[PDB]
Structures are given as C-alpha cells and as structure tokens.
Design a protein around this ligand. Structure first.
Ligand code: GNP
Ligand code: MG
Ligand code: MG
Ligand code: MG
Ligand code: MG
Ligand code: MG
Ligand code: MG
Ligand code: MG
Ligand code: MG
Ligand code: MG
Ligand code: MG
Ligand code: MG
Ligand code: MG
Ligand code: MG
Ligand code: MG
Ligand code: MG
Ligand code: ZN
Lengths: 115, 95, 311, 37
RNA sequence: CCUCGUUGGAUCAGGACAUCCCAAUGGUGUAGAAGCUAUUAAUGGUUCGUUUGCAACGAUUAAAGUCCUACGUGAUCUGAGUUCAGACCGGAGCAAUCCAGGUCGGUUUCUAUCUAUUUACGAUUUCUCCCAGUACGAAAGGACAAGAGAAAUAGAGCCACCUUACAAAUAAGCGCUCUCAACUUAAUUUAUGAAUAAAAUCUAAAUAAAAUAUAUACGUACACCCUCUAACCUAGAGAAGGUUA
RNA sequence: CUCUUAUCUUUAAUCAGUGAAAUUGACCUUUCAGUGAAGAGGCUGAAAUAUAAUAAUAAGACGAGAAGACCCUAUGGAGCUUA
C-alpha cells in the first residue's frame, strides 16, 4: 500500500533509478480516488529533484490469496505519454497486471520474469 | 501469450489507422464468445499495442523500435544483451 | 565537464512567507516619510535576482542600487557591467563591502546629490533626511545600516546582523545613522519575489544564500555550484579538499569531501529482501559544508551572471 | 427564453400567449425573440 | 489637524438558494466537439499538501459553490491576539517611565439540579467497454440515447480466509458481503381545440400526454404476550431479554 | 498521523458500611413562529402532551465559582522620579 511520502524502489534499468543519489524516491501523489496505491496503480514520484510518473508493480502489504507478496515496494518509471522510461525489467512482476483495467501491456513487454 | 507480434509504421497517422482497422475486423470476424479488446497507447504518439486474447501486437514508429528492441528480448529469453548488462548488488557498511 | 546543466522539470524556488507579506505593504505606507530608497543586492548576481516588485511599487523617488558583498566576487568585468546597468535604467550604482567598510563613504554624498536634483514637497521644510533600504534577504541590508552608523556616527551596531536569510522581520523604527547630513535609515525585511523567472535565476540566488537551501535541496544546489565552478576554471575546491584530477560528478566529489571530514550516518536503504540500515558517507553534510566554504569565499571569486548575461 | 420584467414584441411575426400562468411572446421566424414574464 | 478603529483549527454539524458538481431544458455569432448565456431544481457530494501571517504555490477532482447559525460550536478540546508581573533592542523623556514599535518567556476551574437529546430502512458518483472513429464534418477532429463491466465513497452488516492482538474459546480492519421501487410534479416540449371567419393557438379555456431533484401513496423490518428458586448466555452497567434433554 | 484496534490496571457500574462541596426567589421547570434590548420553559398565536426512576451526552438555563481583562468616575489612596 503506497501512500504519499512512502519511500519506493525503482525496479527498472532507467538512468533516473540508479543507485547514485542514494536518497530513495518518495511518492507525491497516488492516482486513485483513494490515496492508497496497490499493484497496477499509478503514482507521482519525487525523484532526483524531478517529478515523474511511476507504476506500482509490487508491495509488501498482504493481498488476496494466491497472489505474490513482495519484500519491497517496487515501481517502474512511466513517461508522460505512458511509455516506460526504462527498456528492461529483471525482477519478477506479478501476472495480475494483465487483466486489471488499465494500460499495462507496454510494461509486460519489458519484463521477462512473471511471478 | 501464445504469440507476440511487432509491427512498424511510417507515422502516427498510419499506426492509428491500422490499429483501428484490425480492431474493426476483429469484432466483425466472429469473436462472439470472446470479449472485446482495448486499444492501449493512444495517448502516446509512437507506440500502440492491442492485447488480443491469444495474440499481442505492438505497433511503433521506427525510432522507438530500435530503442527498446523488443524482438531481442522475446527471441533471446534471458540472454538479451541489455538484460545481461544489469547486475545485482549488496550493501555492507562503507568502513 | 558537462557543457550544459540540465533541469527538465526541476521546481523553481518558492517564497513569500507571511512576514514578507504583512511587511511588504507596511513599506508602502512608509514611503510618505522617506526621501530616498536604497536597493541592496549581492554583487555576484547583478541582474539575476533583483525583485521586480520594488521598482513598480516605488519608482517615483530617486534611486540608487547598492551591490554589497563585492569582496567575494570577481569584478574584472565591472566597466562592461556598469555600461549594461545604464542601458537597463540603473543610473546610480556603486559596489560596497560592509564587513570591511569599503566605499561606504561615497554613498552619502551621492545620496544627498540625488535628493537635491529631485523634489520633496510635503517634507520640503524638514531638515531631517530619512531613506529606506530594501532588497532580497541576506544581502547585507542590516549590515549596511551598522557600517554607515560607525563610519559617520561612530557609535556601532544598531540592527541585528545574522548569517542566515530572514533575520530582520518587520519595518522597524528609525535608526540614527549619520550626524552632519543627519540622514536616517529605515530597515525593512528582505523580500525576494512571487515568481523567480527562470529556475536558473532561482539557483543563482540559492548559491548566494538568498534562498534557504532546505526548500531547494542542498544536493541540487551543490551540483549547480560544481557545474559553475568548473566552467569558470576556478578549481580551488580541489586544494581545500584533496580531489586529485577533479571531477564533474557531484556524487564522486561529495564522496571525497565526506571522507575528508570523517562524517557517517545510519541510513535506511531499500533493497530486494527488505529494508536495512547501513552506515554511509554523509552526502548531505558534505553538501552543506561545501556550500559554506563557497559562501565564505575560500573557493574563489565568482561572478554568476558572467555567462548568461555578459552584455 | 430570456425572462424579462417587461415583455415587448420584437418583430412582425412575434405573437403573445398566456401559458402556465405567465405571458409569453413567441416568434416563429427568430427563436431569439422568445420571452417570458 | 499627523494618526487608527476579536479570529484560526479540531469535533459534530443545523439551515438558506443567490447552484460549484450530479439531473431536466430554452437561446446562440450552436455543423460535430468544445464553449457562452438563461430557466427549473437544495438531491447527495464538495480532497490532500507546501509555505504560517493567512497570502501565493504544488498535485488532483465529476466538483474543490456562495452564505446564515453570538469565531454555529472552548461547563467538548486547542493556537494567536485582547495583554499585563521578567527581559532586552529602536525611538522619546533630566528622570521615574513611555510606544494601539520589534522580539524571548509566561497557571481558569467546574462532581450536570432543570430543559433538550441518546435504537431500522428502500445509494450516490466516476472510469472503461459497446453503440463506434459510426452520426456530423472539406479535413482536422468527434458525439448522443440504449446496453455491459468495473472501481471509489456512504450506509448496513459479517469472521470461511488474510492481518493485528488477548502469547484464551474472542474483538477488530488492513479482510469479506449486501444496497431497490416512485402513485403523484417545473422549467420545458408535443397532440386536439374555442374565444379570434384559420389547413391558427401547449389551455391562469374546456382537454390528452411526455418531461429534474424531491417524496412514502407503495413496500421491507417490527408484531407473539409472557414460566422464572436458580444456573448458564454470542443479551447486558443495573434492570430487561434468551436458553433449561 | 493516514486510521484506528486489542489486552491489562485505575476509574466506572451493582451490593454492603461511612458520608462532603460550590450551588438554590418560588416552580406543577415543553417545541415552533412572532414580539423584544443580537435576547423567551413562563408574553401573543399555533402545536405537542399518562405518571415516575436508572445510565449516558453537553445545545440552552447571558449555567456555577476567582483578588481576571478593558474603559470611565472620585476635589478616594499608595509606590516611584524629579527641574
Ligand atoms: N563577505 C561579506 N559578507 C557580508 C557583507 N555584508 C554582509 N555580509 C554577511 O551577510 C550577513 C549579514 O546580512 P544582513 O545584514 O543580515 O542582511 P539583510 O538583508 O539585512 N538580512 P535579511 O535577510 O534578514 O533581510 C552576515 O553573514 C555577514 O557576514 C560583505 O560586504 N561581505
Ligand atoms: Mg449540513
Ligand atoms: Mg433557482
Ligand atoms: Mg459553550
Ligand atoms: Mg521555557
Ligand atoms: Mg460533563
Ligand atoms: Mg454513447
Ligand atoms: Mg453504599
Ligand atoms: Mg411532575
Ligand atoms: Mg411537567
Ligand atoms: Mg421564540
Ligand atoms: Mg408559552
Ligand atoms: Mg441523568
Ligand atoms: Mg448545556
Ligand atoms: Mg455566568
Ligand atoms: Mg467634583
Ligand atoms: Zn420575432
């Protein structure tokens, strides 16, 4: 459950998410009518003095049975047009992104591993 | 998915037309039991992808194609060059 | 070293705390009893940060621009700058240092000369001259008052002076400054701007200490400082802090200085398996100290406006 | 329909009627002329 | 004559309509889509932060309405001011002191006597899809209505799972489930038709209809008639209530 | 804090013993609109209405207490300073 001011991990190969500038990116906004962000929910990110959109692909909060609970809050950086900023994702991504309402096919194309 | 399809297009106008054309044909061509398909990426000007049940087609302009190189990722499952460049880390104390 | 510093979405400096608002209109009322107005601005940013509001609100009376903090700047250009100022409309200007009380004698003769040419109307018969000092915070407005007070009245410090922006809060009562001309100075809180024009204009002011580094980011300010310091060729930060060949990456240079100062933090890093607290070199403390040495002047004489607005 | 304090005919074809407790001028040629009291 | 004359927040809200959003319409310099303007309607809703004396700013939203209720509301709470005993600066005074000038510090308590009040309802909005990239339009662009699925919030419940506890047989949400009908009516639009010789006219003429938000005609729930030594209870402060091979 | 929850103790509540305080013109002590001093349980006009306890809430009774606050008055004081 990502909220405002939560520290999140950029699970991507994009330059902005690299370990330099150790300060973790923090959530500024959750694009939901509730402010709670779950898997598949977009958020606005404070990263390296920039404001960038990100998509939640994993979090530590328990979900419904038969679904993966991760050890970190993961996100992928998204361009304003909606194209992913990074070109590869190596960490496992839950398969539930496929069905839920939204535009997630672009991200799934980038990720080899699904869990 | 069972199949993965990538298609280049000259301009954003061309990408929209073919995406609409295929969607129109899909609804016309049976799919009575199968549900409808959303068109993704209309906000973007260079990459459109439609996720049919058994097939996913990603349409993009030339320049976008080389940048992402989707074909290499799915052809070489885990031996992709960009995926290989990424590395794992551990974090002990500085001193 | 990187040719161009990129922003592409960095926020501009945001300001106007309440005290700058309730004070801003108390200045306007005081214009009734004021015979002249002094603009104080740091001599490293002759054109960047000047608050547009002052000219519009109070432009009728005679005007002199004071460029304080001239010592910790490179004024080789001067002449070209002075010509540029005249084109803008800045008829009267002179560089001042308040810690060393340099060129602070020339102000009073010039200030009196301007009042002569002008008119006084309601106050025409008064022999007591009152004038106002205004500017962006942390430019030495309060210092100028004390420095004049001791160069003419020879009594000392009358306005509290501090090393942080926003020490003087409100337009206070009159303070005696001179005796023979008998000029009186009114002290006003620093007022920065509602809008800072370009974000670079806001960086240039952050480096000068006008902006409280905590609402712009110490790290971002540090990167701009390194970016400007390398372009100007003033590689004086590689001797104060041993950096060998020098560098263009802020993370690398901040690493070395943190090592030189033996500073460490326990920082929560976010990894795949969870959260772990790891001892780390103090990048933030390094940035704060690195900016301080620049502000003291030991990192070299810098004129920020040299590149964009050479004129 | 503009509701006006005083209603005035605006053209030849304008005509006047008493509908639902109020006076109306209705014009077939120009709907702009429709008015209510 | 130079000067200078209580209100924030929290909690819970009651009400007005001069309507911000949701709904029904007229007009257009309304092709479509965006807009502008008017009428009717008070239905439920009307966010989270940064700066902190409020005034701008950031990100959202269907929308972030305008007001009344002695700042609506301190015998519910809390900040600043009113504003003092200490102390400093700047100015005034020979001084004591002073300033509708700065700043730092700074203790109002209340056990409820009375009125009043403390046990049910029939849901709102957004997004995607379909219609359909169709109608319209030279293109650009780009919809109605009808239909389907998702969420959010609100209300009402619940414990198979998950989660946090009692390292108790339970309670909770961060978990799960359920939410609906409109007799009758306003702006407005049609049909028949006189006053008014018409192949006129929607009618504060006789008439037939359609058409917001409301609501209770209409339904759900409740009903039973009362053993009680005592014990036990998923019922409970007491009392009441339920159970007893 | 979002956003609150569980458990234990104190208190609470029932039983037994002991037993204060401020307060109190009298009261058989209602709602709405009007009137009126910004004002009404008690007046005017409508309305509502078997009688009494127990436990809770704090809108009202300009709720109850203090040597509080502000201003004005007295040919009332007192401390302080002087020219
Ligand atoms: N090197 C140098 N430092 C100076 C000079 N004048 C002032 N400073 C420094 O600036 C600070 C004082 O600034 P100050 O007079 O308070 O400026 P201000 O604008 O009146 N303050 P504010 O922001 O509150 O309005 C001190 O750190 C002082 O040493 C100068 O001429 N040279
Ligand atoms: Mg209300
Ligand atoms: Mg109305
Ligand atoms: Mg009260
Ligand atoms: Mg203290
Ligand atoms: Mg009480
Ligand atoms: Mg439609
Ligand atoms: Mg007893
Ligand atoms: Mg009685
Ligand atoms: Mg009675
Ligand atoms: Mg009354
Ligand atoms: Mg009575
Ligand atoms: Mg009681
Ligand atoms: Mg009360
Ligand atoms: Mg009282
Ligand atoms: Mg007398
Ligand atoms: Zn007409």
């Amino acid at each position: 459950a990502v909220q405002k001011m939560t520290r999140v991990r950029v699970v991507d190969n994009s330059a902005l998410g690299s370990t330099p500038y150790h300060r973790p990116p923090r959530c500024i906004h959750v694009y939901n009518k509730s402010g709670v962000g779950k898997v598949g929910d977009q958020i606005l990110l404070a990263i390296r003095g920039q404001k960038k959109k990100a998509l939640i692909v994993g979090h530590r909060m328990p979900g419904s049975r038969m679904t993966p609970k991760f050890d970190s809050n993961n996100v992928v950086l998204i361009e304003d047009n909606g194209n992913p900023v990074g070109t590869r994702i190596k960490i496992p991504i839950p398969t539930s992104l496929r069905r839920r309402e939204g535009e997630y096919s672009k991200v799934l194309a980038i990720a080899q591993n699904f869990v | 998915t069972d199949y993965f399809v990538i298609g280049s297009g000259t301009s954003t106008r061309h990408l929209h037309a073919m995406v609409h054309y295929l969607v129109k044909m899909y609804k016309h061509l049976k799919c009575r039991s199968d549900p409808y398909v959303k068109i993704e990426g209309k906000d973007a000007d260079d990459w459109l992808c439609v996720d049919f049940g058994s097939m996913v087609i990603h349409l993009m302009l030339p320049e976008t194609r080389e940048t992402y190189e989707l074909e290499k990722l799915w052809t070489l499952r885990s031996f992709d060059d960009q995926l290989a460049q990424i590395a794992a880390e551990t974090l002990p104390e500085d001193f | 070293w990187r040719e161009c510093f990129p922003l592409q979405g960095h926020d501009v400096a945001r300001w106007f705390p309440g005290h700058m608002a309730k004070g801003l209109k108390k200045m306007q009322s005081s214009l009734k009893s004021v015979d002249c107005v002094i603009e104080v601005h740091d001599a490293r940013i002759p054109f960047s940060g000047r608050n547009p509001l002052f000219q519009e609100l109070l432009g009728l009376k005679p005007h002199l621009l004071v460029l304080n903090k001239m010592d910790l700047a490179d004024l080789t250009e001067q002449q070209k700058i002075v010509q540029r100022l005249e084109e803008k409309g800045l008829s009267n200007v002179l560089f001042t240092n308040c810690v060393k009380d340099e060129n602070i004698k020339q102000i009073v003769p010039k200030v009196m000369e301007l009042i002569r040419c002008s008119y006084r109307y309601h106050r025409a018969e008064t022999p007591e001259y009152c004038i106002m000092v205004v500017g962006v915070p942390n430019v030495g407005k309060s210092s100028l008052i004390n420095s004049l007070r001791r160069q003419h009245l020879r009594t000392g410090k009358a306005a509290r002076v501090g090393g942080e922006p926003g020490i003087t809060r409100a337009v206070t009562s009159r303070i005696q400054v001179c005796e023979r001309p008998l000029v009186f100075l009114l002290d006003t809180p620093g007022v920065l701007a509602p809008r800072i024009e370009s974000v670079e204009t806001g960086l240039k002011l952050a480096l000068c200490g006008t902006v409280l580094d905590h609402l712009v980011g110490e790290e971002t300010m540090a990167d701009y400082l390194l970016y400007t310091l390398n372009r100007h060729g003033l590689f004086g930060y590689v001797q104060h802090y041993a950096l060998a060949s020098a560098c263009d990456q802020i993370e690398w240079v901040l690493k070395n200085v943190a090592i030189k100062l033996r500073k460490t933090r326990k920082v929560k890093v976010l990894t795949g398996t969870g959260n772990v607290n790891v001892i780390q070199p103090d990048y933030a403390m390094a940035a704060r100290d690195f900016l301080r040495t620049f502000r003291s002047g030991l990192l070299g004489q810098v004129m920020l406006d040299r590149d964009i607005i050479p004129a | 329909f503009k509701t006006k304090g005083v209603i005035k005919k605006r053209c030849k074809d304008c005509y006047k009627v008493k509908r639902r407790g109020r006076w109306f001028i209705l014009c077939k040629t120009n709907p702009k002329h429709k008015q209510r009291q």
